[PDB]
Homo-oligomer: A and B are copies of this chain.
Amino acid sequence: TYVSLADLERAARDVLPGEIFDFLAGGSGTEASLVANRTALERVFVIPRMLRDLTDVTTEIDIFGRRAALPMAVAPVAYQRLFHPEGELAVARAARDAGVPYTICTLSSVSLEEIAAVGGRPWFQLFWLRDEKRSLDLVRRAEDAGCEAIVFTVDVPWMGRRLRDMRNGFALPEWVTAANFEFAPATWESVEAVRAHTDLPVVLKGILAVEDARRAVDAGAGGIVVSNHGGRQLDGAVPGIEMLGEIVAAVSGGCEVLVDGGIRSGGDVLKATALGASAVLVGRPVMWALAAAGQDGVRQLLELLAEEVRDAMGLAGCESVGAARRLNTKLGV
């Protein structure tokens, strides 16, 4: 019986080999951006409203044309067989059963078509390939398999310097492969190529500058994820949570604005919402639950987050996620 997301991190550290726990936990460089994601959420306080009608509190949203049960999706995390033998299929099944979107990775350890067959209306995360037309082929595979959005990762012209991985000499076990199969830096040209090749909404993940948010709308994106890649890319990149309010104001409803990095409770989901997010992504905690207890672990985590989101919303006087977006906040110490 886990009563917070931190109970699951403790359980995952017990089970996983050290080097795999480090691949999961780590960030780039000195891990300043990884720590700052948590700092930034901890400094945000909500100003709750009282005495509102809570007869029919709902945590549901509509996004990219589908109803979701919570304002949350599972973030793209590569190589989930590292954490549990059922890898992506375990997490995808749990997500489906919880009504939350699951992002299938370009570097998934089970093929995208197998994970899409689980059901649950899935999203697909794209890394740009050096071999471009292979890029558009992954996108078409994803669309043919029933994925509902293309989450184009735009913060990885190459992978950051993960010092834990270097120190550990980490490499994929022989038994974990990139099951969908040397990548190139993406540009605004790449975005347009993808937009022209699909009818699915294109979501740019890894935007932090206001002007890049605005350009994303101008480029025809359906959404952005305001994100420093969990502190795994530029060490010293600002947390997404610190940019979110400014970005929300700048796009002024022109696309969905998601945030990630450090979300560890339903109260953090409420903070993100109050700052203007349409939804959040959650990465590491979903992998902790997978490592600890497989599919059932992920189910328990999603049930716990659902309960915490509903609790937080109602304590704050919000019968709907839209009401939560109208909450005010105060930055503390």
Binding site for B on A (CB under 8 A): 3-4, 29-30, 32-33, 36, 39-40, 42-54, 154-155, 157-158, 160-161, 163, 166-167, 185-188, 190-191, 204, 206-209, 211-212, 233-239, 242-243, 265, 267-268, 270-271, 307-308, 311-312, 314-316, 328, 330, 332-333
Contacts and interface: CB of A to CB of B under 8 A. Distances in A.
B191 A51 contact: yes
Contacts of A158: 311, 314-315
Nearest to A191: B51
A154 B191 CA distance: 50
Given A46-B237, A51-B190, A51-B204, 5 more contacts: A4-B30, A47-B209, A47-B238, A49-B209, A158-B314
A163 B32 contact: no
| Most chain B beta-carbon neighbours within 10 Å: one of A40, A238, A239, A307 | A238
A187 B48 contact: no
B209 A48 contact: yes
**Which of A45, A207, A238, A333 counts the most chain B CB atoms within 10 A?**
A45
A117 to B, nearest CB: 33
B163 A236 contact: no
A1 B167 CA distance: 10
A46 B236 contact: yes
Contacts of A52: 187
A44 B206 contact: no
Contacts of A211: 49
A267 B29 contact: yes
A331 to B, nearest CB: 10
A43 B333 contact: yes
A315 to B, nearest CB: 4
Contacts of A187: 51-53
